Design a binder for this molecule. Structure first.
Ligand SMILES: [Mg+2]
Ligand SMILES: [Mg+2]
Lengths: 251, 277, 50, 1341, 50
DNA sequence: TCACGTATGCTATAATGTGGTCTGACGCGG
DNA sequence: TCCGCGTCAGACTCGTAATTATAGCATACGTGAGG
RNA sequence: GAGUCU
């Protein structure tokens, strides 16, 4: 693919495939030319070296260094490592309708609530706004609804307030050691850029407000909303699943 | 424990015969006449020569073995077109052929985007000129400074130095540590976000509803022209193939369909709202 | 360490008591960075098995 | 005796220990080191001189041609630092080197009388270090961090177990050169000595001695003591050395003379040994059976036959003894090898050694490094000599030879860089000594073995690499070419050297963007030591021993400053007084104690020198101008601490501060803080963003002023004198005659840097400190940098703080702040952001920067001017266009809808797109500055041209004012010289100054002074012309940009950010917090006096944290402000200068045993009221580190303020008006706003762009990324029930392409149904496994 | 013990995702092993209901 | 049948075996 | 007994974007436009 | 590469 700078950028698999094709075609040539066997042998060694580098580079001894000196990333390397495809793209992924910010106390909150910044929530519930806007007939179509949100019109705030009502949001903190590292809350729209967390659940997250941050995730489907409200809600996860004791404890 | 392809091959080459002058002449006469053994022996004996030039041609494009192999191809052409009748030695003639084939291969295979020898040769002159400029101008050559010296076009010099720009690895993690590869930064430009794809669905669906809101003959020549309902996107004159068979009446009716539809977008709430986009 | 710190933080440490404190402190901090990995690797082995 | 800037505001000192040595220049390391690299030394091989003499002269392979080095020279820098930073170029000097091509005749033997061609060739530009200690690389300020590596020399180490559950300690020697192969010696479980050359395969150690031409008997004579066996008459005798037996068990009855000493089968104690030695025992009779096993030393042959009876190093028997006797040998030299002390190691190693002679040994060595390739004798001798005995491939360096010789207990420090045969044997000897039990292992973590490489050494090495690459090219071309036409410059290439150095100063790990949040961040970054990067440790390689505090770190490395992270222990801040010895070891100052009296004689001791002496502690009490008060002083030696008598004491710690680094020295009551919290405190001070109003610290230490001055960010006066002209831009000082040189005009101009961008996009602004017409001395602060008060370092703002809960608004470290803080714009911060717009040339055609942009509102185009550039001063907000840019689109095959749409509005808008630079979303600021970079050939923008008009006229004005003020100042001197011996006061002023070339006086020294001033005047006259031509050329000069790029427009925005909930704040005792709420003034706890508290911090974040420093800082802070409130009250009521003087003298001279005396009096009345006006906003106090203020001194100061001794006050709740039920600690804590603003961290995304291969959304806020849903987070949903939430996260939220669009449409349609699919990552996985040649198929239902 | 127990599971998609992926896939490829997707990790990988 | 970028082709003094980083650790096979 | 290969917590932020060297000229190979 | 939560 072309970078903006006019330059191109490519996978190392292309360098490994080009190695294999050059040496293979050179072998075809030297066979057409009836070359003496010492030279044929050298080319057959080099061909096996190139294929073995292409499949799994570094297993067959000294890995083939590309441009920096770093060994070229081969086929097996894209599957194997933790970074392969299993651990990185398949057993876990980057996710839509996800956000983050610094956390701060919400002592005024009830246990099942969390302060969610206005601008953050505006963005996460974009399709839900578009939808109500068209059912009220305030927006003629989606592109006009988008421009009304971009202008951040006063009627849009009132609609956004209506969508967020009784809609649970997942808060997550790294590291997620046990299941209470994810909990669902009913969000409370707040002016300001910081997420407000209920004190009593700070224990489960191991949350202290000296700059920790949290991920926000929006359960989209009716099913996901119900699993968040029933199974994952703060109120419903009071006892530690580890030992019988309440995790939700004053401190 | 000799496992290395290179050390094995170089062991095998050393283990060959070295040829003399009178021996080169005897074998060369038999070789051109088409001797099997003569060709094999002349090639095998002169492999050492390939390696000397191949060893002084590394760290430029391919690896030592790659260069040695292509250099061996030059050796073969050299043995094929050698003249033993001329008193002048084989080593002298072969050196040309080995350097030629190595250089040519290094100009083609090395560059990921295959760069033509014509541009490469021109590039060589630009670079050698830059070197002479750098020695006297303590600074480095500008594009315009190089162009002034060769009496050639600034644009042509800039195009060439642009092609010199070598390719960055996508798989390579950048942030010093293996933090994030470039692949993960760079998004798919050809794939539209679900937001954009959904907007086109809304437009395409509205059009079907807008086609059953205007006149029957105002949406029969406006859509069959753009290729909206029809199969092929025709022009004002080509709408005549269907039933219209007109040029003036087609252009009046196309624009009449659009003018009534412009007021349908001003009333529904777009027009200047959907103008920015 | 064979020599304990006799003093407390209200009293204030001297240069030698503070320098001697550093050892334990930094080993603690290095422990959080480096040992967390084996704890976490054990979580992951357990999870995969069950 | 105080300086002028100290007369304005004096800090009260609670220190009691007089400082015999002042804090040195803190950026000493970077400057000295690089200065050595560029420094022209004829002899002292340092940097370039060394590099050329090392490589050169390079002679050809043929030997006809040679190139030799004469000398080098740095051209002046093409662009100043300023132009480099703006343009984005490296600040460098061209390196021109004189080189002489000399040619020999091949026909004559070595006739040099053929061709000598000498010329000055260009080899790269070398980047230059700034006066501050930085390099500007591609327009970015960067610092190259000093490195810490294992010193070349020898090291003796030992696997403590590890290998062989046997648990055997295997000793090893490692000889490390500065350049060459490594030479390893090691033991095997079976006690065989082995050699690893370049840590390759193992070889018997004796083989290397055979390669150095050692016969077997010579080897044995080297390691082994000989024992002589005389065969007399019939009985066997052996020459006894009284001790040797010693701690052995007697195997035979030992009889001496006729009388039995040992009993057979009993252990020989000390008494037997002294009895035998005193009796003078030299022969003892022994049984023949004892020799079975003894090793013969020499070759013994039959003098009759002349054949070998027994070879050297052969185990003796009863029959070989018999054969030896009858041949005619009655003396047998046998090896002394009694286990225990004298082990037979080399004896057993010779039996393992398969080689015989020298050649056989050289062949086996050759076969190890080059396995397969047949030996030749020439090849094996060449290889072995080229390993450790070639001057070109092997170099221990001076430090290597020196550490090597000291480790082998030599007298001589200096010697050869190549290994001698004696060196290797001495090393083997010491290895074996250590195995025996006499002698010890060297410690790798010991700073005596860890050496510092700052910049100049590292620049030198990369520069040598460049030269070596060049040498191959040069030698190659010298041999091939004809010698006479060919000159030296056609052979040399500059690009290899330039490339080696460019890669160091740009690609290198140690070259990193300067940490410029604040002065302390900069100064600490420049004094960093890293064990990482090239030639060093890795995070993988790094264990736990290296990371921990070593005893030798005392006075050299900070124990309490190290990144809390993966780099913990590998990166180290330098101690305050620490410095590099000549060889590059760290050293620390110590006061010599002579005859018990403690002199001011100060000695810098290396790590190794320190171990040898007993050093008293700094806190040790000295008695008034002589010896220690106390009999048993607390000291330290041999790396451990206890009490000593006075006569034993050799030395003493110079300052109490020398243990600590710079950053930690700024922490007041460090003494009362846990070392962990203190570490994070020193670490967060570096993150402190400078506020709009730089406020001094009320509770300081005294390092404040040193740091502000040495950082370079403050303008300091070199010459002093009186200030002629102040301006918010410039300061001109007229110099005093005593420092003012009579040559050039004596007027210093300091131009101040106005509101400029930092690397962290913070604001750099210099304001003038002094007023118009103020007298100043050398080293006075003339202008304050960004985070500096009158000369002192001011990282943040002190505040009235109360420790008490609020309604959970300070739950876990959460901070409750008063609205008054926001109102007073304290912790309001300035961020200058640089945005660039690049006009590139594409295959379709060049991009245009016109204001004429398709599909754009009049609102947007209003702010752009004719060219398409936003106006200076214009306020902008997200989405506003800054630089309008359009890109040529190639023939757009449209969807029918777009054909219709483009037909309806008729806005075809040509063949062009919209790629305009617009303000990033949510960032909002005012445009302060615009820069335009155009190519040389391309026609300039209208806006670019008006910018050059401004720069040209401004340049003209600047230079004109230079020549005007310099001419006025110069004639003002001529006027004074002419009066000297020629009174013409009123007569000289009337005629024009321009017609003064005629004016002279009689021929004396004063006539020569007139000539100096006249030659300077005209020099300045032409100088002004050539300066102006240079400026004009640079302003017209078209800049060469990247290929493809036609022009670049850089916009600078200024953003004012307010403090707000989510913003991160901390103190200096590692006490962090996030702001939870901003409380109305009415609501905040208030005093009996009615004054509201600024910040309410949680008490419970102190006793757990064990940083008690913050509480002492708060009590003293209130006491400081108590006295400021008294001075404020006395200044409001005017009152008497006498009365103010009384109170202030009593105040400064309070402390029980205050070191600092302040004899107020001498201060003039005007100095006193300027001083009180500064002391009014709180008397600034200094608590040194480990010599700080005592509780009793703080309570005494509080009583002087009429504040409570408890430092607790009655508080009233702002809301209810009722009192809090108990006293609350209130006072002033100096607080810092760190770089971590919520504004920068808040991020949210519904749908966006998606990744190329994996199709998953991107990461990071910069790429508008979705949050990573990790394995850990997945498992949480698995533990719950939540299967739909998990599938959501796997499929429609990430890869599933069809699914995500379909579900988006459903959510706008309000269906809230998933309709899942197949994740594209898995499709890829399949394709990647089939690419491996594994058939992986989906089997259907 | 834990590591081997996780590799001994008769799902090769779980074994591969855990560790030793190269070895797991050669042994599965040679055995012609068929994974019927009973486990949780297997279903999460194919993006299905747990 | 050229016009114009691309491609193949040949040169003859003699020359004929190559040449960066160096240190983890604790487990478990073969 | 010694070498080989295999693992080694989880997110987040920034910031930047390099180097080398391969000759010169005559016929050979392919497509499009104009005569 | 230098950081921020654990
Ligand atoms: Mg905590
Ligand atoms: Mg925290």
């Amino acid at each position: 693919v072309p970078l903006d700078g006019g330059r191109f950028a490519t996978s190392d698999l292309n360098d490994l495939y080009r190695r294999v094709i050059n040496r293979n075609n050179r072998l075809k040539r030297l066979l057409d030319l009836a070359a003496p066997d010492i030279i044929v042998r050298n080319e057959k060694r080099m061909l096996q070296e190139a294929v073995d580098a292409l499949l799994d580079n570094g297993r067959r001894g000294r890995a083939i260094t590309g441009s920096n000196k770093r060994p070229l990333k081969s086929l097996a390397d894209m599957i194997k490592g933790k970074q392969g495809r299993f651990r990185q793209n398949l057993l876990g992924k980057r996710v839509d309708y996800s956000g983050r910010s610094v956390i701060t106390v919400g002592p005024y909150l009830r246990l099942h609530q969390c302060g969610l910044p206005k601008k953050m929530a505006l963005e996460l519930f974009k399709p839900f706004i578009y939808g109500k806007l068209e059912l009220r007939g305030l927006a003629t179509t989606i592109k006009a609804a988008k421009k009304m949100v971009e202008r951040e019109e006063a009627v849009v705030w009132d609609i956004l307030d209506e969508v967020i009502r009784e809609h649970p949001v997942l808060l997550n903190r790294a590291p997620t050691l046990h299941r209470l590292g994810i909990q669902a809350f009913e969000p409370v729209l707040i002016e300001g850029k910081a997420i407000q967390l209920h004190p009593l659940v700070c224990a489960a997250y191991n949350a202290d407000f000296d700059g920790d941050q949290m991920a926000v995730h929006v359960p989209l489907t009716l099913e996901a909303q119900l699993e968040a409200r029933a199974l994952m809600m703060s109120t419903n996860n009071i006892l530690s699943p580890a030992n019988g004791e309440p995790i939700i404890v004053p401190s | 424990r000799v496992l290395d392809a290179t050390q094995l091959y170089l062991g095998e080459i050393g283990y060959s015969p070295l040829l003399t002058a009178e021996e080169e002449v005897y074998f060369a006469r038999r070789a051109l006449r088409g001797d099997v053994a003569s060709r094999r022996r002349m090639i095998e004996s002169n492999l050492r020569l390939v390696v000397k030039i191949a060893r002084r041609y590394g760290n430029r494009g391919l690896a030592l073995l790659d260069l040695i192999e292509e250099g061996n191809l030059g050796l073969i052409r050299a043995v094929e077109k050698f003249d033993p009748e001329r008193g002048f030695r084989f080593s002298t003639y072969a050196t040309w052929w080995i350097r030629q084939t190595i250089e040519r291969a290094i100009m083609n295979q090395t560059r990921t985007i295959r760069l033509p020898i014509h541009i490469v040769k021109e590039l060589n002159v630009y670079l050698r000129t830059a070197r002479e400029l750098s020695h006297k101008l303590d600074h480095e050559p500008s594009a315009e400074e190089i162009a002034e010296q060769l009496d050639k076009p600034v644009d042509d010099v800039s195009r060439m130095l642009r092609l010199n720009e070598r390719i960055t690895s996508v798989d390579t993690p950048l942030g010093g540590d293996s933090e994030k590869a470039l692949l993960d930064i760079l998004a798919d430009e050809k794939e539209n976000g679900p937001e954009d794809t959904t907007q086109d669905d809304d437009m395409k669906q509205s059009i079907v509803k807008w086609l059953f809101e205007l006149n029957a003959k105002q949406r029969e020549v406006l859509a069959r022209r753009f290729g909206l309902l029809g199969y092929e996107a025709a022009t004002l004159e080509d709408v005549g193939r269907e039933i219209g068979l007109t040029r003036e009446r087609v252009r009046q009716i196309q624009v009449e369909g659009l003018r009534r539809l412009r007021e349908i977008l001003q009333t529904q709430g777009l027009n200047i709202e959907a103008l920015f986009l | 360490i064979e020599t304990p710190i006799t003093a407390n933080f209200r009293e204030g440490l001297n240069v030698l008591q503070y320098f001697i404190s550093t050892h334990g402190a930094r080993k603690g901090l290095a422990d959080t960075a480096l040992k967390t990995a084996n704890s976490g690797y054990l979580t992951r082995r357990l999870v995969d098995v069950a | 005796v105080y300086s002028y800037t100290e007369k304005k505001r004096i800090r009260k000192d609670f220190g009691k220990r007089p400082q015999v040595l002042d804090v040195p220049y803190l950026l000493s390391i970077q400057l000295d080191s690089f200065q050595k690299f560029i420094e022209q030394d004829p002899e002292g091989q340092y940097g370039l001189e060394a590099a050329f003499r090392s490589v050169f002269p390079i002679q050809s392979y043929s030997g006809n041609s040679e190139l030799q080095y004469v000398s080098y020279r740095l051209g002046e820098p093409v662009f100043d630092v300023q132009e480099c930073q703006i343009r984005g170029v490296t600040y460098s000097a061209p390196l021109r080197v004189k080189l002489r091509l000399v040619i020999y005749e091949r026909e004559a033997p070595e006739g040099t009388v053929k061709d000598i061609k000498e010329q000055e060739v260009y080899m790269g530009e070398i980047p230059l270090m700034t006066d501050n200690g930085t390099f500007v690389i591609n327009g970015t300020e960067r610092v190259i961090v000093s490195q810490l590596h294992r010193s070349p020399g020898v090291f003796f180490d030992s696997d403590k177990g590890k290998t062989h559950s046997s648990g055997k300690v295997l000793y090893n020697a490692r000889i490390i050169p500065y350049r060459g192969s490594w030479l390893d010696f090691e033991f095997d479980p079976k006690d065989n000595l082995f050699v690893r050359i370049d840590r390759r395969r193992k070889l018997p150690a004796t083989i290397i001695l055979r390669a150095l031409n050692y016969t077997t008997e010579q080897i044995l004579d080297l390691f082994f003591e000989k024992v002589i066996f005389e065969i007399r008459d019939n009985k066997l005798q052996m020459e006894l050395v009284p001790e040797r037996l010693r701690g052995e068990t007697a195997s035979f009855d030992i009889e001496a003379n006729g009388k039995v000493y040992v009993e057979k089968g009993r252990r020989i104690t000390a008494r037997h040994i002294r009895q035998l030695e005193k009796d003078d025992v030299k022969l003892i009779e022994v049984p023949v059976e004892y020799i079975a096993g003894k090793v013969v030393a020499k070759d013994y042959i039959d003098e009759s036959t002349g054949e070998l009876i027994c070879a050297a190093n052969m185990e003796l028997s009863l029959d070989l003894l018999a054969k030896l006797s009858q041949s005619g040998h009655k003396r047998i030299e046998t090896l002394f090898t009694n286990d225990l002390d004298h082990g037979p190691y080399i004896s057993e190693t010779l039996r393992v050694d398969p080689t015989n002679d020298r050649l056989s040994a050289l062949v086996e060595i050759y076969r190890m490094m080059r396995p397969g390739e047949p030996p030749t004798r020439e090849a094996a001798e060449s290889l072995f000599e080229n390993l450790f005995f070639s001057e070109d491939r092997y170099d221990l360096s001076a430090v290597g030879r020196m550490k090597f010789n000291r480790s082998l207990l030599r007298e001589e420090i200096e010697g050869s860089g190549i290994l001698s045969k004696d060196d290797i044997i001495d090393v083997m000897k010491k290895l074996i000594d250590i195995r025996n039990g006499k002698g010890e292992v060297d410690d790798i973590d010991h700073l005596g073995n860890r050496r510092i490489r700052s910049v100049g050494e590292m620049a030198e090495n990369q520069f040598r690499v460049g030269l070596v690459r060049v040498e191959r090219a040069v030698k190659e071309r010298l041999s091939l070419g004809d010698l006479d036409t060919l000159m030296p410059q056609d052979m040399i290439n500059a690009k290899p050297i330039s490339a080696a150095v460019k890669e160091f100063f740009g690609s290198s790990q140690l070259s990193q963007f300067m940490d410029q949040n604040n002065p302390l961040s900069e100064i600490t970054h420049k004094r960093r030591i890293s064990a990482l990067g090239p030639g060093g440790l890795t995070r993988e390689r790094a264990g736990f021993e290296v990371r921990d505090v070593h005893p030798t770190h005392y006075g050299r490395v900070c124990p309490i400053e190290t990144p809390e992270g993966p780099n913990i222990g590998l990166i180290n801040s330098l101690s305050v007084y620490a410095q590099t010895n000549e060889y590059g070891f760290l050293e620390t100052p110590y006061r010599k104690v002579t005859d018990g009296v403690v002199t001011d004689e100060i000695h810098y001791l290396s790590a190794i020198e320190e171990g040898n002496y007993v050093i008293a502690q700094a806190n040790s009490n000295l008695d008034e101008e002589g010896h220690f008060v106390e009999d048993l002083v607390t000291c330290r030696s041999k790396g451990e601490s206890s009490l000593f008598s006075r006569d034993q004491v050799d030395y003493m710690d110079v300052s109490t501060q020398q243990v600590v680094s710079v950053g930690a020295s700024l922490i007041p009551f460090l003494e009362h803080d846990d070392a962990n919290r203190a570490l994070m405190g020193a670490n967060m001070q570096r993150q402190a963003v400078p506020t709009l109003r730089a406020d001094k610290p009320l509770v300081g230490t005294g390092m404040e002023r040193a740091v502000a001055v040495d950082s370079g960010v403050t303008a300091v006066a070199k010459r002093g004198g009186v200030v002629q002209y102040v301006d918010a831009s410039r300061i001109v000082i007229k110099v005093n005659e005593d420092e003012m040189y009579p040559g050039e005009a004596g007027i210093d101009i300091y131009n101040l840097t106005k509101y400029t961008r930092s690397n962290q996009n913070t604001c750099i602004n210099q304001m003038p400190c002094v007023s118009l017409g103020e007298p100043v001395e050398r080293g006075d602060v003339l202008a304050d940098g960004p985070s500096t008060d009158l000369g002192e370092l001011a990282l943040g703002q002190n505040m009235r703080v109360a420790f008490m809960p609020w309604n959970g608004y300070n739950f876990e470290d959460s901070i409750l702040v008063s609205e008054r803080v926001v109102q007073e714009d304290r912790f309001t911060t300035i961020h200058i952001q640089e945005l660039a717009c690049v006009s590139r040339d594409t295959k379709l055609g060049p991009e245009e920067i016109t204001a004429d942009i398709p599909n754009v509102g009049e609102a947007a185009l209003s702010k752009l001017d004719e060219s398409g550039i936003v106006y200076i001063g214009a306020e902008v907000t997200g989405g506003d266009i800054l630089v309008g840019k359009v890109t040529p689109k190639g023939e757009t095959q449209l969807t029918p809808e777009e054909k219709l749409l483009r037909a309806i509005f008729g806005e075809k808008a040509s063949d062009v797109k919209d790629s305009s630079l617009r303000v990033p979303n949510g960032v909002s600021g005012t445009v302060i500055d615009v820069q335009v970079f155009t190519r040389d050939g391309v026609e300039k923008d209208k806006r670019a041209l008006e910018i050059e008009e401004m720069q040209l006229k401004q340049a003209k004005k600047d230079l004109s004012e230079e020549l005007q003020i310099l001419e006025a100042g110069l004639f003002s001197r001529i006027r004074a010289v002419l009066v000297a011996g020629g009174v013409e006061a009123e007569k000289l002023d009337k005629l024009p100054r321009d017609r003064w070339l005629e004016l002279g006086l009689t021929d004396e020294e004063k006539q020569n002074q007139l000539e100096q001033l006249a030659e300077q005047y005209d020099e300045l006259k032409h100088e002004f012309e050539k300066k102006l031509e240079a400026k004009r050329r640079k302003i017209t000069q078209g800049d060469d940009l990247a290929p493809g790029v036609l022009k670049i427009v850089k916009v600078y925005l200024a953003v004012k950010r307010r403090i707000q909930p989510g913003d991160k704040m901390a103190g200096r005792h590692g006490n962090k917090g996030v702001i939870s709420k901003i409380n109305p003034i009415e609501d905040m706890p208030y005093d009996e006096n009615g004054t509201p508290v600024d910040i309410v911090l949680n008490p419970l974040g102190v006793p757990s944290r064990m940083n008690i420093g913050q509480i002492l800082e708060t009590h003293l802070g209130m006491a400081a402000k108590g006295i400021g409130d008294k001075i404020n009250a006395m200044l409001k009521q005017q009152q008497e200068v006498a009365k103010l003087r009384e109170f202030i003298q009593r105040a400064y001279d309070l402390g029980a045993d205050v070191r600092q005396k302040v004899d107020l009096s001498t201060f003039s009345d005007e100095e006193v009221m300027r001083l009180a006006e500064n002391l009014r906003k709180g008397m600034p106090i200094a608590t040194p580190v480990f010599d700080g203020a005592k509780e009793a001194e703080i309570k005494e100061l509080l009583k002087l303020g009429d504040l409570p001794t408890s430092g607790q006050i009655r508080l009233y709740d702002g809301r209810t008006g009722e009192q809090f039920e108990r006293p609350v600690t209130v006072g002033y804590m100096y607080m810092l706003k760190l770089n971590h603003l919520v504004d920068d961290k808040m991020h949210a995304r519904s749908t966006g762009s998606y990744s190329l291969v994996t199709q998953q959304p991107l990461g990071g806020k910069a790429q508008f990324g979705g949050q990573r849903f990790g394995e850990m987070e997945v498992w949480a949903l698995e533990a719950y029930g939540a299967a739909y939430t998990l599938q959501e996260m796997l499929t429609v939220k990430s890869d599933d392409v069809n699914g995500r669009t379909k579900m988006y449409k459903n959510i706008v349609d309000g269906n809230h149904q998933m309709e899942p699919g197949m994740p594209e990552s898995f499709n890829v996985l399949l394709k990647e496994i089939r690419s491996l040649g594994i058939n992986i198929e989906l089997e259907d239902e | 013990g834990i590591t081997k127990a996780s590799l001994a599971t008769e799902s090769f998609i779980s074994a591969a995702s855990f560790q030793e992926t190269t070895r797991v896939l050669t042994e599965a490829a040679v055995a012609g092993k068929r994974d019927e997707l009973r486990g949780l990790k297997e279903n999460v990988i194919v993006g299905r209901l747990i």
